[PDB]
Structure 1
Amino acid sequence: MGSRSRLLAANAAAAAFYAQALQSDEAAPARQYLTERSFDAAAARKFGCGFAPSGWDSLTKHLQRKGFEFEELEAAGLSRQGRHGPMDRFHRRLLWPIRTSAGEVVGFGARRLFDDDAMEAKYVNTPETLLYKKSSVMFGIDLAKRDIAKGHQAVVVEGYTDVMAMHLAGVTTAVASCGTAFGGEHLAMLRRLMMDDSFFRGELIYVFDGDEAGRAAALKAFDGEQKLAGQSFVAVAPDGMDPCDLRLKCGDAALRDLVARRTPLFEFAIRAAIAEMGRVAALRRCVPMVGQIKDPTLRDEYARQLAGW
């Protein structure tokens, strides 16, 4: 009663309820969002997409009629106390269920659809619960679990739709940061999956959108390496575009090629720091970045091109 397995059962029931609600008449703008960026009904079914209806307590009453207590639904991050009693967390938004590697639903990502939504924020998430941990949660990990372990390769994208675009394109190793900064506990989980017996072989591919944030995300690499920046790589789409948009304009094959055309994470972060730039401030900014490389042989390789670049 209020146990881990019970909280999981509520989320699975909520995922079913929300998935069904996507076919309602009021969920047409949610279906529009998906079809407008080329995700068909079968794709929406694969990732478990749903719609949080306009009834303020419609999930809560639905789960309450199946025997779930309000105390359990608050613990699961599904319901919360309103003025008139128990009410839903999510309201009039396109939902993606966020699943563990096994495939157990632990929370939801909720995107804004209507201009009269009281919540101004573009994306909204499940709060910190027993099951949901912002720092370790990853969208797409259930579907990619097998192919990253077999292929020894993980592709990290930013958004929910970027993962969907990647998996439909054939890049089934794609996963997302999931409503927060990526680093620390996802790397541990991804490293752990790509490990052969005893030693680390695989590689990690970050795919940033064409933006100033591309470099401003890449500088985080040097802030704690965790011996994975040597095996980390960077791909960047034609300026302005993210993976979801790239698949719309240039098709599924263009995304597979994007992942193939990857630069090492150090090389990218350094050469980008040199590119957008003088020589006084340059050699000040770049020599700490190279010095923080813990491997001596790999440090010497990049240390050569500081004179060149």
Structure 2
Amino acid sequence: HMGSRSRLLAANAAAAAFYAQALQSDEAAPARQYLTERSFDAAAARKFGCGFAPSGWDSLTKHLQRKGFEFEELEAAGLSRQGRHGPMDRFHRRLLWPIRTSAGEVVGFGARRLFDDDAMEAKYVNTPETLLYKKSSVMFGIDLAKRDIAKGHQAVVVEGYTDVMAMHLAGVTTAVASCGTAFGGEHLAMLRRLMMDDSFFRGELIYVFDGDEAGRAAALKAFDGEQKLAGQSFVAVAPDGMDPCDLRLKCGDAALRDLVARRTPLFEFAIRAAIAEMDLDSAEGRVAALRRCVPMVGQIKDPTLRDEYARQLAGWVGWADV
């Protein structure tokens, strides 16, 4: 029993149920307001397991001790830590999102700062590394997304918790997000696994960025490694400045669906964005543009894909019929 995988999972399952209840308190008002301020109702907050970590020292820690969980289990679980005068909660006075496995089991939390006088000055904090929680592979929304990424052959990677919430509310039930870190190798590996039918990788990785310089970071990165999934990787960017949560507030659910559906392939986005910052109305600027994008096509390792982009370059700078 003591400190097994399933015991820690029972503790986190217990913790999330408590924090859920705590969102229905008087001091948790600013957490609820944060939610309604960006159009997430009580049905939504419940669907994503949204909770509140209350003030005080050890509200959760005592709760789980009083229902049989020893403190050593809770430390390895990541829910509690050792203070000067005994045990205390890890999370205090924050809006919490439970972070789940693909099966739906809670393995940790992401926690947003609400109050200006809270000692922890970081905007987001997470559960640290545990037997359950692994920063590099864990994804918010993956529990709600799993069935629909396999059926639709599609995963949609967004930046934050409220972006997943907004996407799923607007019918983009394939949206997921890395928690407290960059989206990386083993997040890709896990989505890749879900999108196998037989031994073939089938589907699309649609990255949704916000602020076009964050999108240009991924573009200049797109030729770097072995380019494994580059051919099936796509980009969607909101009307400049905006993110999925904001785009939904202004323009509604349908604007999000259309943002995802009108995604551009990753190489095409990289090449054309580099053509965009150039003068295409003279022979000189024509020439300069090719001088910088022919090398980009040069780096595409897949010869089918390289030829496809090489074919279209002249058309894009204006030298030929598109």
| TM-score in terms of structure 2 length | 0.91
Deviations 1:137-185 (A, max 9, x none): 0000000000010111111111100000011100101101221111211
Q: Displacement of 1:306 after TM fit?
A: 4.5
Range with greater deviation from structure 2 (12-21 or 289-298): 289-298
Measured in 2, the distance between the counterparts of 1:241 and 1:287 equals 31
**1:110 partner SS:** strand
Q: Displacement of 1:293 after TM fit?
A: 2.0
Measured in 2, the distance between the counterparts of 1:183 and 1:274 equals 28
Q: Displacement of 1:85 after TM fit?
A: 1.2
**2:208 partner SS:** strand
Q: Displacement of 1:224 after TM fit?
A: 2.2
Range with greater deviation from structure 2 (297-306 or 137-146): 297-306
Measured in 2, the distance between the counterparts of 1:116 and 1:169 equals 35
Measured in 1, the distance between the counterparts of 2:87 and 2:156 equals 40
**1:108 partner SS:** strand
Measured in 2, the distance between the counterparts of 1:276 and 1:43 equals 41
**1:111 partner SS:** strand
Deviations 1:45-67 (A, max 9, x none): 00000000002111111111111
Q: Displacement of 1:109 after TM fit?
A: 0.4
Deviations 1:223-242 (A, max 9, x none): 32552110111111111110
Structure 1 regions of 5+ residues with no counterpart?
Answer: none
The alpha-carbon distance between structure 1 residues 146 and 115, as it changes in their structure 2 partners (threshold 3 A), is: same
Q: Displacement of 1:186 after TM fit?
A: 1.3
The alpha-carbon distance between structure 1 residues 300 and 35, as it changes in their structure 2 partners (threshold 3 A), is: same
The alpha-carbon distance between structure 1 residues 226 and 56, as it changes in their structure 2 partners (threshold 3 A), is: farther
Check whether the contact 2:297–2:310 (CA below 8 A) recurs between aligned residues.
yes
Deviations 1:27-46 (A, max 9, x none): 00000000000000000000
The alpha-carbon distance between structure 1 residues 240 and 193, as it changes in their structure 2 partners (threshold 3 A), is: same
Q: Displacement of 1:279 after TM fit?
A: 9.0
Range with greater deviation from structure 2 (129-138 or 289-298): 289-298
Check whether the contact 2:156–2:208 (CA below 8 A) recurs between aligned residues.
yes
Larger Rg: 2
**2:197 partner SS:** coil
Structure 2 regions of 5+ residues with no counterpart?
Answer: 279-284
Q: Displacement of 1:82 after TM fit?
A: 1.3
Range with greater deviation from structure 2 (144-153 or 270-279): 270-279
Range with greater deviation from structure 2 (266-275 or 160-169): 266-275
Q: What is the aligned partner in structure 2 of residue 282 from structure 1?
A: 289
Check whether the contact 2:78–2:127 (CA below 8 A) recurs between aligned residues.
yes
Q: Displacement of 1:274 after TM fit?
A: 3.3
Deviations 1:186-223 (A, max 9, x none): 11111111111121221111111133212113333323
Measured in 2, the distance between the counterparts of 1:186 and 1:290 equals 27
Check whether the contact 2:54–2:93 (CA below 8 A) recurs between aligned residues.
yes
Q: Displacement of 1:273 after TM fit?
A: 2.8
Range with greater deviation from structure 2 (94-103 or 116-125): 116-125
Check whether the contact 2:212–2:237 (CA below 8 A) recurs between aligned residues.
no
**1:96 partner SS:** strand
Q: Displacement of 1:297 after TM fit?
A: 1.1
**1:144 partner SS:** helix
Q: Displacement of 1:73 after TM fit?
A: 0.8
Check whether the contact 2:81–2:88 (CA below 8 A) recurs between aligned residues.
yes
Check whether the contact 2:195–2:203 (CA below 8 A) recurs between aligned residues.
yes
Range with greater deviation from structure 2 (281-290 or 82-91): 281-290
Q: Displacement of 1:70 after TM fit?
A: 1.3
**1:73 partner SS:** helix
Deviations 1:234-279 (A, max 9, x none): 1111111100011111111111111111100111122223323589
Measured in 2, the distance between the counterparts of 1:27 and 1:178 equals 23
| TM-score in terms of structure 1 length | 0.95
**1:182 partner SS:** coil
Measured in 2, the distance between the counterparts of 1:198 and 1:255 equals 32
Quote the RMSD (CA, aligned, Å).
1.9
Measured in 1, the distance between the counterparts of 2:224 and 2:19 equals 40
The percentage of aligned residue pairs carrying the same residue is 100
Matched, 1:303 2:303: no
Check whether the contact 2:227–2:301 (CA below 8 A) recurs between aligned residues.
no
Deviations 1:91-142 (A, max 9, x none): 1100000001000100000011010111111111111101011111000000
The alpha-carbon distance between structure 1 residues 40 and 298, as it changes in their structure 2 partners (threshold 3 A), is: same
Q: Displacement of 1:302 after TM fit?
A: 1.6
The alpha-carbon distance between structure 1 residues 172 and 280, as it changes in their structure 2 partners (threshold 3 A), is: same
